Design a protein around this ligand. Structure first.
Ligand SMILES: O=C1CCCN1c1cccc(NS(=O)(=O)c2ccc(F)c(Cl)c2)c1
Length: 127
């Protein structure tokens, strides 16, 4: 089971902009999760080949990871905060869909998601 192309991080005809909320998503939210002890499984797309997960991309049809999110934020790929928040939620949800309750990877996602929720709670008002 081969890996798919990763999610796009560049698309010239996609409308995009910088907002103060998107800056916060990079400087606070992504930075916080990225430095966490449990970040590493989430720092790049799932390599189904090297991880011996041949069913991964038969089950997970909307893959997402923080490597992709990081690049999207660095490239100002998003139009608004909700697009980026949705990417984080997709990443967490994928983990819970694919894996079993109590698996190490799920505990790791749960810890990252708690921090995500704490930071998004203080998302600044736009502009
Ligand atoms: O579901 C996801 C999203 C991100 C990676 N991932 C996933 C699911 C199932 C196995 C693996 N393989 S692994 O990277 O070597 C691994 C990583 C952390 C762990 F705690 C354990 Cl027990 C194994 C990865």
């Amino acid at each position: 089971s081969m890996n798919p192309p990763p999610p796009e991080t560049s698309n010239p005809n996609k409308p995009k902009r910088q907002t103060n909320q998107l800056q916060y998503l990079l400087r606070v939210v992504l930075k916080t999760l990225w430095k966490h002890q449990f970040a590493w499984p989430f720092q790049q797309p799932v390599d189904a080949v090297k991880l011996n997960l041949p069913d991964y991309y038969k089950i997970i049809k909307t893959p997402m990871d923080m490597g992709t999110i990081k690049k999207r934020l660095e490239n100002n790929y998003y139009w608004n905060a909700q697009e980026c928040i949705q990417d984080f939620n997709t990443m967490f949800t994928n983990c819970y869909i694919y894996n079993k309750p109590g698996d190490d990877i799920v505990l790791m996602a749960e810890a990252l998601e708690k921090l995500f929720l704490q930071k998004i709670n203080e998302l600044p008002t736009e502009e």
